[PDB]
Amino acid sequence: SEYGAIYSVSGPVVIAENMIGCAMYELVKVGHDNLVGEVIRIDGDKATIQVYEETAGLTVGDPVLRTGKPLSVELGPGLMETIYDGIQRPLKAIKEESQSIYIPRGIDTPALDRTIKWQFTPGKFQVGDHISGGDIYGSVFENSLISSHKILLPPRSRGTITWIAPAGEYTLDEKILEVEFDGKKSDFTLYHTWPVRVPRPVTEKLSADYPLLTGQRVLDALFPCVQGGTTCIPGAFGCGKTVISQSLSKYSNSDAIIYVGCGERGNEMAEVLMEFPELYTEMSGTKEPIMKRTTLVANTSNMPVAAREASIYTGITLAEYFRDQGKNVSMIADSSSRWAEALREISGRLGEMPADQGFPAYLGAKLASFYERAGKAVALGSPDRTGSVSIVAAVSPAGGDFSDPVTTATLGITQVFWGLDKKLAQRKHFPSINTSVSYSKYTNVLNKFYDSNYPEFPVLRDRMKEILSNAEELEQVVQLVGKSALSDSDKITLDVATLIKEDFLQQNGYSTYDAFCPIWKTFDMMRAFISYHDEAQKAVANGANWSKLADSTGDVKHAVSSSKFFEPSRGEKEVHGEFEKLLSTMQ
Amino acid sequence: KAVEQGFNVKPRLNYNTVSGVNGPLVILEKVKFPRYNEIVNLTLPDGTVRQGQVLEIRGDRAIVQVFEGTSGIDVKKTTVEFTGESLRIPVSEDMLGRIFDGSGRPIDNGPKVFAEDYLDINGSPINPYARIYPEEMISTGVSAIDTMNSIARGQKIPIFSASGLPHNEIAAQICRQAGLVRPTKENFSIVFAAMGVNLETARFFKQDFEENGSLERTSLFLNLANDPTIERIITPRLALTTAEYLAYQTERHVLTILTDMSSYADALREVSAAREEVPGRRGYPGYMYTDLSTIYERAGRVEGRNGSITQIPILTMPNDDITHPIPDLTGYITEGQIFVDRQLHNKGIYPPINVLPSLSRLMKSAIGEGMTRKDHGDVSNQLYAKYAIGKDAAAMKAVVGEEALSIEDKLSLEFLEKFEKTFITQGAYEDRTVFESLDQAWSLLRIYPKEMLNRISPKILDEFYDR
């Protein structure tokens, strides 16, 4: 029968016997509580299961029921503005049903609300027309921000629309489409399930060429990311990997946000559920809660370690689903090192040979497969649409050491490296980005964007990188021999770099003027700082005393420093007064 | 009621099939339907009874960790009885004002607890949707914490200390002076777990609870350094299940401290090594983040219950190394850390809290307009900026002398001396209000000219810089 028996239990790993005829990565209900687990290995009639719940109390001989299906995610209306339990079940509905502050073991709750009536409106397809996977055969109004949630045929479905529902209010369970393929008729509702471990197909993978404009000056200017790119944020335990993630979730260009908390605090998923509704986005033309377009995949550290893996699959699959609707999604995975620890904990309890630091030999392959799901792509099916999935993965190196297996693998895979510095985070220098080691490999492509919007941007960025590197090399000398032994040019370089660090690179993410910094403001500030450096270098090059000139031009320096304080609210060309009130008041 | 199901007798199987004993672990061979995480009672040949937890099951084989140690256990006359349940603690509100073993047995010469319930010591992870984000600031009385590392009621913030350092005195002062900045309209209940501590450490905490009348509000779980090591793996969960019962089941605001949580890591490594598992850094278990997060994350507030758990684990960093696995994984799980510093302590300062490595993750939201004061965040950030610059001015003066450090560096040296010796320095039993501490911070930032207080916005720099 479908019932195997538990043979061995150790941590999250349950080995079940009588499991002959079991498929890899098949979901199983373990025990009498029907805990959800996935068959990870098959050895004869013995199937090894990673249980996604607490295994405490599991007995040898307990039933294990095959489900015949993989770990799947439900995709459809009712997915934004919601928070999920690592696996695809909803936490708010769980609380409402169990009427308790805990998550009951083995509770079953449909992922998408099946009582909400969605205002379906059919698309461009009619009866007798051919439909294939990815074809938007309708749209429902989900919320004021996501005003048209595309209803796509499942990626692996096909046939001739035998029947298409009219415009009206339908629940998720009501039939919406009938499609005949080889005489067999299939029924499609407003939602469909997709294996979270299979990447969703696309027509072709494009080249990411548009910037992922965060609100951060250092990340936008020095180490830019693109829409569809992969970035990692390694850092110690208080340098701001989660504040960067949340600021990006708040102010990024992305049409949708998939915020995955893989083994993180439950007060950091609670703050996102508290602030994102109170934070709004005018990307739709009117202020709509950023939460209206931002969904969550809360799986804290007290929560099963094996569901830290199902948390990262769910998030990337949701981003791929929303990219398949023409949207530019951003999956923010905080943290990727907690998913690697979960695979190190499963592998260790699973018996196979450990790698460098106990991790499995296939950790790199798993990370590569996860990051290969990000990118810009043309969506399968018509109407022709293009979407992108960016991945921002926070890595948490053991002790802050970037030589770790997970950090090394991610740096091998990802194209942007926003390495954080603990020393800078202690001075409250935020974002605490290590400009010495951080790199962006998207600067080359972004050339086009800059040539179309800010031609000086790459040159100014390179100049600021050069100044910062010189000052890094020079402050070490000054710490030992004193500032008065330097050349006036070197002292100008040090002063300029200090000003840049304390006024351009440092950005209070929890204020009104520096919670967000648009690219035009970043470019203007960059021009101001570089122009100040050029003015000082010329004044000293043709003969002057920098020591006195600093006092003489103290107020010009003050104005350049205070450029930080301009409120972005007075958008574009009111702040752009600094083009003359700063670059003509001096320099 | 639910308690009515307790009127049931469930006979237990007594096995006498022990096949191995190595370290904490006893292997028992012919179990009938072994149950994971189940608690068993080992009767020794001597006749004494010990308790153990089933760490792994495989067919008829079970691996049990004995909390009280495996000394005196033999394979012939030692019997093991399987209870069929996990480890449950009896909980009543009469636990408050009592002292227990690390296993939860009374040591105050009082009777056992007349239970109102038997609550599994592993609890259950709180629904992240049911959680409230803590925002009620607690005046610890200590300016180094209230003004720069402000703790919110419901926060989990340990004390990263080392050996020879006054982290017990700091924690006692916090428990003694803790209270809301704006009272809602009552004293915290306290749950104190001690793992592998000295006898004089436990005596200090107990007598300081005596002195302040907070012992009637206190349950102590004392696993001393002369008690079994493995029993330390249950002490913090028995104490967090008692704290939880007061916090949600009785709706009691509670402050629960897991003293020497760093010692619990040693017991977790001992058990893991006995099991020959694949180790992490320094030999510690690869699952130590998941084992320390099942203790640290049992703190916070929940929506409909008017109670909270504020957790202050105390953690001694080996060799003062913050990159050591224990402090490292605590930092990645906890919402801040009060860093007790040996350089400040040797320098005569108390509390020797170095605010630079310290952090409060819930301070941003706990401070500001209408709830502490408007200058609290800007003042704190400016104090961090000026302290980080005074400590680098003092390194340049150590190698180069004053004659080659700028005027701003001299101002920062002056700021550093008064910060550490007048603001961070503070007597025990000296309770400063978050407002006195902000006034003293303003007095120390006036050392500088209004123009170099560049981390304060002009609005705040205008009202408070000139008073």
């Binding site: 018996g351 040979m353 450990p354 106990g358 | 020959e276 598992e277 694949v278």
Partner: peptide, 10 residues
């Protein structure tokens, strides 16, 4: 660890 696993549990 690797030698123990391979030569005892494999």
């Amino acid at each position: 660890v690797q030698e123990k696993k391979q030569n005892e549990t494999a």
